Amino acid sequence: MRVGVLGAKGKVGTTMVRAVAAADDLTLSAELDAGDPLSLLTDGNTEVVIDFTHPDVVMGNLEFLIDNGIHAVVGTTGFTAERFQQVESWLVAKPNTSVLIAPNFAIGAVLSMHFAKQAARFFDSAEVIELHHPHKADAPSGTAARTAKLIAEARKGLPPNPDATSTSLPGARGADVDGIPVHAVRLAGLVAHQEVLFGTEGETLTIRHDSLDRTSFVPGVLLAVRRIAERPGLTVGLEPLLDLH
Amino acid sequence: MRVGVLGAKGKVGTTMVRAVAAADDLTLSAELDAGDPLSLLTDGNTEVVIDFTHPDVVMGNLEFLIDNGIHAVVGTTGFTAERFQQVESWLVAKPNTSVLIAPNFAIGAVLSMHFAKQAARFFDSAEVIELHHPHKADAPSGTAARTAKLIAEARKGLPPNPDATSTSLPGARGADVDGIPVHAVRLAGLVAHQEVLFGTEGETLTIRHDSLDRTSFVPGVLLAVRRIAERPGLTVGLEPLLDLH
Amino acid sequence: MRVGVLGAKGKVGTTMVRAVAAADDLTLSAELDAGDPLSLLTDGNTEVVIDFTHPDVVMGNLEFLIDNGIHAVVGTTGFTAERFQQVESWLVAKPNTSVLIAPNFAIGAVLSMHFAKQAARFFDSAEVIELHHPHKADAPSGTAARTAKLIAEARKGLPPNPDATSTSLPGARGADVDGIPVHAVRLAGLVAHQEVLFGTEGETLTIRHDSLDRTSFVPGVLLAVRRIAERPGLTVGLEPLLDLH
Amino acid sequence: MRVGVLGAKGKVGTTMVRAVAAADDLTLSAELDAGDPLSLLTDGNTEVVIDFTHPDVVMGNLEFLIDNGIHAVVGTTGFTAERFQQVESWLVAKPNTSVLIAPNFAIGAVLSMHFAKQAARFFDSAEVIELHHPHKADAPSGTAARTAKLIAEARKGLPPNPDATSTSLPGARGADVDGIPVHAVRLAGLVAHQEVLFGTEGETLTIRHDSLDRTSFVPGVLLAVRRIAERPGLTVGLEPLLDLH
Ligand SMILES: NC(=O)C1=CN([C@@H]2O[C@H](COP(=O)(O)OP(=O)(O)OC[C@H]3O[C@@H](n4cnc5c(N)ncnc54)[C@H](OP(=O)(O)O)[C@@H]3O)[C@@H](O)[C@H]2O)C=CC1
Ligand SMILES: NC(=O)C1=CN([C@@H]2O[C@H](COP(=O)(O)OP(=O)(O)OC[C@H]3O[C@@H](n4cnc5c(N)ncnc54)[C@H](OP(=O)(O)O)[C@@H]3O)[C@@H](O)[C@H]2O)C=CC1
Ligand SMILES: NC(=O)C1=CN([C@@H]2O[C@H](COP(=O)(O)OP(=O)(O)OC[C@H]3O[C@@H](n4cnc5c(N)ncnc54)[C@H](OP(=O)(O)O)[C@@H]3O)[C@@H](O)[C@H]2O)C=CC1
Ligand SMILES: NC(=O)C1=CN([C@@H]2O[C@H](COP(=O)(O)OP(=O)(O)OC[C@H]3O[C@@H](n4cnc5c(N)ncnc54)[C@H](OP(=O)(O)O)[C@@H]3O)[C@@H](O)[C@H]2O)C=CC1
Ligand SMILES: O=C(O)c1cccc(C(=O)O)n1
Ligand SMILES: O=C(O)c1cccc(C(=O)O)n1
Ligand SMILES: O=C(O)c1cccc(C(=O)O)n1
Ligand SMILES: O=C(O)c1cccc(C(=O)O)n1
């Protein structure tokens, strides 16, 4: 399988390149970076590409890939409904091509979102604390925003979190994601971490995921790369790829 | 509903007494303590009793209760297979009577065991850290031992945790519960806490439950008390009464 | 020693009342609550009063106390420079009277602020996460704000925390306290908790304090109550009371 | 300054080699590995060597280095009193040569031991939890054992930790290091982590250090390498080179 990496120079990209180069069943056909022509992909006859670039260019590359029938495993965050809809209104005019987008390829993270959904109804309060390296451009993380959305969707009928906050400094209570407060920590020495807190009478439940190394995203990426053709079109998250694993 | 409390003087017992006394749909019929005759129960026409005593007496009281057809919601730990088996038969001679035993009545704890079971297969390493007040007689906690057992049972076909420990101080690697290391911390200022750690390539997953107050066990207890008659015989755990599997 | 409690009905107040009532060397002379005349204090010939009321009334009571020469151990938060200055411009016109104000009476908390000050210079990043019960009116906590101030004051010559945040949801990065981000979590089941995070190349340092029970403030309060007369005027924090202990 | 690395192939060694190679003021004179002759050091005219090998060989290399007057910054754990004593004399016959041994070069770790010493007296209970990668040969970690020793030494006059443990599974309460329980966790995905827990009435204090990356040891190592000649003889720890006492 010929595989090319979009953003091969990035923190995550360089890792994926190393991973694909080590995969005995995969062939690194392309190593695109900022500026390099998207034609380099069609040159190496790439069939699947791993995208770990920037939200300002994803939509751009996604058009090219979907055109030449090249499959795509995208990790680049900042995917909005309109964008998904964009990607949607494209695959239709060129099926047989598969595209997978996931806010997090770490298995522990996917499991965290899974458990968060299940525990939400049993508690009065729910908050999300996300912590990342000081090089992250977006706050809060895509995963945090998605986790908050999942929680808020599971507590549909229930009342909102209890909060007697009368006086407060601007921003002290974090960002509001569908009624669920989300706090973003940018600290040196960190990579990718998340904490989901549920609280009730005399007890709390904490589901924490820690990505100590960027290699933690490899397994999920390669898994999606190999079984990419299994599902045509868009997928979103890698939950379907292992809900039975 | 007439409800009596066994061990009404204990740390947990005094809380249950207060809870039952506040329950508008429940009547505190008995407040037994160490020494007090089990006949006080039959005196107040008790139909259900909450047991939070000591493992050295549970079996004793359980016989009396099961005889007079009184239902029992037991929280007292130290329940072994033989003990469970014993109680099993005890009721077979007196059906129509219900008995529920649970290692933990905190919902977060029950959920922790639920999630632990589901995540076990996805990781290479698994360990349990349990932390309690310095007044606990047993180490590790009943919940910890049960959680470790659940994890070990979910990883049936998989190899054991990787460990290159060559030299070590006695007891440094905690207790072995079916191949899963369990560490017991006894610290002042704590109540009931547990941490389940799963580890793999570049990432870890932590599921932590915190019982900051003993009132956290009330909801689970009262829930079992009210729906006690729903399931005749012996029931181990709170899961059956919960939506989860 | 005759001791009266201001706000004897509050979550913390009721605890202090119980504590003073148990102190064999202390006499509970007053149990004021909302509405009750401040004259009840002068009635029982109170010499020291524990204040755990509300920031909207502290200044009021503080005037009365300082007038009748009654000593005061205040725990009520929301103490600003002007207010301190107010309390300052009063004791002068009536010395021989002592007043102690502390943002936190938990020893672990005081120690946390102590360590935070010492570690600040050794790290690139520093952030504060504070977590409290959903009944707290102010965000962030007084202790959190004070800890952030201490940290920012210790890193005087050093550059600010590195942060590449380009796009962000309003409030995601918490409140800014002298360049130190502070996050406030309001969750059910919690009491008083704080986490100080320091980060640098490949490592982080976390100093966490947990007030699982309101009784944790008793030792510090009573300590200040007994040795109150030792220092005339205002003090601020109970660091001087044990920097040598 | 000519610097050679002992164990240049190890997890930590390869990092130090990369670090020294990047240091504009340092020259990588040697890259010894298992088997390679210690004479390679005398070949490149090495003046200082970084040792990150194995406790079974340290004593061996230390003799050679101290003989040829080569300075040594040793990170290899497993240093016992007898071993320290031995090295002591080894240098007495060859002064003018400096040797520094430290159980941890991460600044956060050194600070942790510093704070642990200061907080010990203020609490009833104290326990240490250490967590490392599943490739560590010794349990508990050298740092954990040292931290436990420091704590036990600071609580000289005070009574031991309160523990009502009557029944227990073998090893559940961790290893005993001078009366301080130490728990060792070996999990995949981890690197080097430690947690010091202090407990008292209604509150706990946690001092946690996290080495997410092995690069975290570089700063401390290079600092000791450059200022090595400053202190003739043997030096244990990094504290001397630091502002702290
Ligand atoms: N879903 C997941 O599991 C994960 C997602 N991510 C997300 O992936 C993205 C990047 O990760 P990270 O490595 O930290 O990011 P980087 O800051 O390292 O940026 C990655 C690479 O993309 C580049 N690049 C930019 N534009 C193009 C382009 N048009 N064509 C090809 N290359 C381009 C960069 O070049 P230059 O910088 O010179 O412009 C850089 O080399 C973020 O959105 C991040 O949140 C990260 C980890 C995991
Ligand atoms: N399943 C769960 O969710 C939970 C289970 N537990 C378990 O429940 C038990 C209680 O712990 P905790 O309440 O903190 O401990 P305590 O010892 O504080 O409470 C125990 C009470 O039982 C007593 N008692 C002893 N024997 C009898 C008897 N035969 N008849 C009635 N009273 C008796 C005691 O008296 P005296 O002390 O004078 O002997 C004491 O009042 C433990 O086994 C604990 O592990 C605890 C919390 C939760
Ligand atoms: N420094 C420290 O270690 C700690 C400080 N605090 C601080 O102390 C304050 C309160 O603690 P908490 O118990 O949670 O608060 P509560 O919400 O329980 O309020 C406390 C009591 O003060 C009352 N009170 C109000 N005004 C007066 C008045 N003028 N005269 C006397 N009584 C009055 C209340 O009555 P009503 O509600 O009916 O008006 C209530 O009974 C807060 O500022 C909190 O942040 C808390 C813990 C520790
Ligand atoms: N003080 C501190 O801050 C730190 C201390 N340490 C300690 O340092 C040591 C290193 O751990 P780590 O690097 O992860 O382990 P590794 O085993 O990955 O690194 C050890 C290296 O030393 C080797 N080597 C063995 N004997 C010799 C020898 N006689 N001459 C030179 N090379 C030799 C190895 O070869 P081979 O494997 O083939 O035998 C291996 O390359 C441990 O004792 C660890 O506890 C670790 C981190 C920090
Ligand atoms: O959901 C996210 O935005 C996310 C998840 C993991 C890592 C990163 C990152 O390194 O930027 N971002
Ligand atoms: O599973 C247990 O043994 C357990 C759970 C909660 C509290 C206690 C306790 O207070 O002893 N013990
Ligand atoms: O610094 C604070 O504001 C503080 C500290 C401890 C407890 C509380 C509280 O219970 O409101 N508030
Ligand atoms: O004190 C120790 O033994 C220690 C400290 C950091 C890392 C390691 C290690 O990687 O073995 N060991």
Q: Which residues 6+ apart lie within 8 Å of A22 measured at CB?
A: none
The β-bridge partners of C182 are C128, C175
Interface list for chain C against chain B, based on CB atoms closer than 8 Å: 189-191, 210, 212-213, 216
Integer Cα distance of B217 and B102 in angstroms: 11
Please name the residue that has the structure tokens 């244990």: D236
Integer Cα distance of A130 and A197 in angstroms: 11
CB B129 within 8 A of CB B185: yes
Integer Cα distance of C224 and C105 in angstroms: 9
Specify the DSSP element, H or E, that contains B41.
Answer: helix B39-43
For every residue of D141-192, which 3-state class applies, written as one string? CHHHHHHHHHHHHHCCCCCCCCCCCCEECCCCCCEEECCEEEEEEECCCCCE
Å between D12 CA and nearest CA of chain C: 13
Amino acid residing at D118: Q
CB atoms within 10 A of CB A65: 24
User: What are the domain boundaries of chain C?
Assistant: 1-105+213-245, 106-212
Alpha helices for D11-101 (secondary structure H): 13-22, 39-43, 58-67, 81-92
D142 has binding-site annotation? yes
Specify the DSSP element, H or E, that contains B185.
Answer: strand B180-186
Integer Cα distance of D129 and D99 in angstroms: 30
Integer Cα distance of A40 and A124 in angstroms: 53
- Smallest CA-to-CA distance from B102 within B217, B243, B226 is with B217
Structure tokens of D150?
């420091």
Specify the DSSP element, H or E, that contains C209.
Answer: strand C203-211
Taking each helix axis as running N to C, give the angle between helix B142-154 and helix B107-119, from 0 to 180 degrees, rounded to the nearest 10. Answer: 20
Contact state of A190 with D213 under an 8 Å Cβ cutoff: no
Structure tokens of C111?
């120690």
Q: Which residues 6+ apart lie within 8 Å of B153 measured at CB?
A: B178
Q: Whose CA is nearest to atom 45 of ligand 2?
A: B77
B115: buried, middle or exposed (CB in 10 Å: 19+, 13-18, 0-12)? buried
Integer Cα distance of A54 and A72 in angstroms: 15
Specify the DSSP element, H or E, that contains A125.
Answer: strand A125-132
- Smallest CA-to-CA distance from C40 within C18, C64, C60 is with C64
- Apex A189 CA angle, A188 and A190, nearest 5: 95
Closest by Cβ to B175, choosing from D124, D145, D171: D171
Specify the DSSP element, H or E, that contains A200.
Answer: strand A192-200
Question: If you measure CA to CA, which chain A residue comes closest to C204?
Answer: A189
- Of B110, B130, B141, B186, the one to substitute when testing ligand 6's pocket (max ligand atoms within 8 A of C-beta) is B141
Integer Cα distance of D199 and A22 in angstroms: 49
CB A17 within 8 A of CB A31: yes
Spell D182-220 as b/e; 16+ CB within 10 A means b: bbbbbbbbbbbbbbbbbbbbbbbbbbbbbbbbbbbbbbb
Interface list for chain D against chain A, based on CB atoms closer than 8 Å: 189-191, 210, 212-213, 216
- Smallest CA-to-CA distance from D62 within D34, D90, D43, D93 is with D90
Spell C210-221 as b/e; 16+ CB within 10 A means b: bbbbbbbbbbbb
CB atoms within 10 A of CB B63: 13
Contact state of A122 with B111 under an 8 Å Cβ cutoff: yes
Contact state of A210 with D189 under an 8 Å Cβ cutoff: yes
CA atoms within 13 A on the CB side of D200: 21
Q: Which residues 6+ apart lie within 8 Å of A156 measured at CB?
A: none
CB atoms within 10 A of CB D45: 12
Domain at D106-212: CATH code: 3.30.360.10
Integer Cα distance of D13 and D6 in angstroms: 7
Integer Cα distance of D29 and D45 in angstroms: 7
Integer Cα distance of B50 and B53 in angstroms: 9
CA atoms within 13 A on the CB side of A121: 10
Q: If you ran DSSP here, which 8-state letter would residue A7 be given? A: T
Please name the residue that has the structure tokens 């990150």: D52
Cα Rg, chain D, nearest whole Å: 19
Question: If you measure CA to CA, which chain C residue comes closest to A167?
Answer: C138
Chain B hits for D161, Cβ within 8 Å = 134, 186
Please name the residue that has the structure tokens 């899974």: A114
- Of A54, A112, A147, the one to substitute when testing ligand 1's pocket (max ligand atoms within 8 A of C-beta) is A54
Integer Cα distance of A67 and A56 in angstroms: 19
The secondary structure of C171-194 as a DSSP string is TTT-EEETTEEEEEEE-TT--EEE
Q: Is the CB of D103 under 6 A from ligand 8?
A: yes
Question: If you measure CA to CA, which chain A residue comes closest to D192?
Answer: A212
Structure tokens of B76?
């007292």
Domain at B1-105+213-245: CATH code: 3.40.50.720
CB atoms within 10 A of CB A159: 7
Chain C hits for D201, Cβ within 8 Å = 213, 215-216, 218-219
- Smallest CA-to-CA distance from D111 within D235, D215, D219 is with D219
> How far, rounded to the nearest angstrom, does the alpha carbon of residue D179 sit from its chain's CA centroid?
21
Q: If you ran DSSP here, which 8-state letter would residue C160 be given? A: P
Taking each helix axis as running N to C, give the angle between helix B107-119 and helix A107-119, from 0 to 180 degrees, rounded to the nearest 10. Answer: 150
Name the pairing type of β-strands B125-132 and B192-200: antiparallel
CB B130 within 8 A of CB B140: yes
Name the pairing type of β-strands D125-132 and D192-200: antiparallel
Q: Is the CB of B192 under 6 A from ligand 6?
A: yes
- Smallest CA-to-CA distance from D10 within D31, D26, D27 is with D31
Please name the residue that has the structure tokens 């470790």: B148
Integer Cα distance of D110 and D100 in angstroms: 15
Integer Cα distance of B20 and A243 in angstroms: 42
Name the pairing type of β-strands C48-51 and C71-74: parallel
Backbone dihedral angles phi then psi of residue A179, each to the nearest 5 degrees: 85, 0
Counting atoms of ligand 6 from 1, which one is nearest the CA of B140? Answer: 3
Integer Cα distance of D241 and C112 in angstroms: 24
